Amino acid sequence: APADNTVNIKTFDKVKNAFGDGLSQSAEGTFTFPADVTTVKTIKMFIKNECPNKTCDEWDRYANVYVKNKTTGEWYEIGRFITPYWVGTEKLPRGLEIDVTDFKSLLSGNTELKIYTETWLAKGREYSVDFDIVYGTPDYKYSAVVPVIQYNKSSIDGVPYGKAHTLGLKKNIQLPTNTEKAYLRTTISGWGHAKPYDAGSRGCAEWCFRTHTIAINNANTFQHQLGALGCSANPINNQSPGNWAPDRAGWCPGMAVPTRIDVLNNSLTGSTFSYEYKFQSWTNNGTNGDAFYAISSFVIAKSNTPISAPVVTN
Numbered sequence: 001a002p003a004d005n006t007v008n009i010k011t012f013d014k015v016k017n018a019f020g021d022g023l024s025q026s027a028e029g030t031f032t033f034p035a036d037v038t039t040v041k042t043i044k045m046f047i048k049n050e051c052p053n054k055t056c057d058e059w060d061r062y063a064n065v066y067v068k069n070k071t072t073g074e075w076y077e078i079g080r081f082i083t084p085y086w087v088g089t090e091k092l093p094r095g096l097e098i099d100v101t102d103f104k105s106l107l108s109g110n111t112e113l114k115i116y117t118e119t120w121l122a123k124g125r126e127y128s129v130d131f132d133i134v135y136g137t138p139d140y141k142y143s144a145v146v147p148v149i150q151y152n153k154s155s156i157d158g159v160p161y162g163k164a165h166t167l168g169l170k171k172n173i174q175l176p177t178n179t180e181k182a183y184l185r186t187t188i189s190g191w192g193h194a195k196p197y198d199a200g201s202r203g204c205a206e207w208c209f210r211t212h213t214i215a216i217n218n219a220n221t222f223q224h225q226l227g228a229l230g231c232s233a234n235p236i237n238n239q240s241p242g243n244w245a246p247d248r249a250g251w252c253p254g255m256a257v258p259t260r261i262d263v264l265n266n267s268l269t270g271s272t273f274s275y276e277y278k279f280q281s282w283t284n285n286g287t288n289g290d291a292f293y294a295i296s297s298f299v300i301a302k303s304n305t306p307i308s309a310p311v312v313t314n
C-alpha cells in the first residue's frame with residue numbers, strides 16, 4: 001500500500017516574546033495546515049528556543065502555545081513548557097516536543113496560533129515552532145475538543161491555591177450521543193513558595209508535592225500526582241548557574257509541562273455529567289506570597305461518524 005506519509009508544517013520562525021515598550025509577551029500568526037484531518041493519526045509540536053550567548057531573559061519562565069477556535073475566536077492552550085534557565089533548547093535538536101493530536105480538528109486550513117512567554121525583560125525569548133502530521137489510520141475518523149476550564153493566561157493567572165474557598169472548578173459536560181471514546185486532557189503547574197512550608201522548606205505551589213483529584217458525577221475518578229519528574233536528568237543539562245536540578249511539583253525548568261490523559265467511562269456517553277477538579281487541601285497563611293495552579297482541562301470526543309464538540313456549562 002502507498003506508504004503513509006508525514007508532513008512537516010513550519011509556522012513561527014524565530015519569533016520573539018518580550019517585555020518592553022514596543023514589545024509583546026506573545027506572538028500570533030496564521031499558518032496554512034492541510035484541510036483534511038480524517039486520516040491524521042498523530043500531530044507533534046516542536047518548540048525550538050534560540051538563546052545563544054545568554055541573549056535571553058535567563059529566568060525559567062512560564063510559556064505556552066494556543067490554537068484559535070475558528071468559530072468562537074477562543075484560544076485553546078495546546079501545549080505548555082517552562083523555559084530553561086540561561087540557555088535555550090539547543091541540547092534538543094528538534095526542540096521541546098508536545099503531542100497536540102487532540103487538537104487535529106482545529107489544526108486544519110488557515111489556522112491562527114499564539115505563543116506566549118511570561119518574560120519581563122526586553123531580551124525576551126525567541127522561538128521557532130513546527131508540527132509533524134503523521135497520516136495513517138486513526139481508530140476514530142472524527143474528533144472534537146472543547147475546554148472544560150482554562151486558567152492559564154500566565155502562571156499567576158492560575159487558580160489561587162490555599163484560600164478559604166476555591167471556586168470555578170466545577171462544570172457540567174454533555175457528550176454527543178455518537179461519542180465512541182471520550183477523555184480529558186489536563187495540563188497543570190504550580191507557582192509560588194507560599195507558607196506554611198511543607199517539610200523540607202517546600203512552599204506552595206511550585207515546591208509542595210500534591211495529588212489532585214477529578215471527580216466525575218461526584219465520584220473521585222482520576223488523580224493527578226504532581227511529584228518529582230527527575231529534573232536532574234533533564235537533557236537540557238547546561239542550565240547552571242540556575243537552580244535547574246531540584247524537582248518542582250509536576251514540572252521542571254526547560255521541559256514541557258506534562259499532559260495528563262484520563263479516559264472517561266463509556267457509560268457517560270449521551271449524558272450530561274458533573275466534572276470537578278479538586279486541589280489537595282492546603283491553607284496559605286499569607287506570610288510568603290501567593291500560590292497558583294495554572295490549569296487547562298479539555299474534553300475530547302471521538303467517533304467514526306461526525307461528532308460535534310461536547311457542551312460545557314456551569
Ligand SMILES: CC(=O)N[C@@H]1[C@@H](O)[C@H](O[C@@H]2O[C@H](CO)[C@@H](O)[C@H](O)[C@H]2NC(C)=O)[C@@H](CO)O[C@@H]1O
Pocket residue numbers: 059060061062082118120155156190191192206
Ligand atoms: C515557571 C515559574 O514559576 N517561574 C518563576 C517566575 O515566574 C518568577 O518571576 C517572577 O514572576 C512574577 C509573575 O510573573 C513577576 O511578578 C515577577 O516580577 C518575576 N520576578 C522576576 C525577578 O522576574 C521567578 C522569580 O521569582 O521565579 C521563577 O523563575
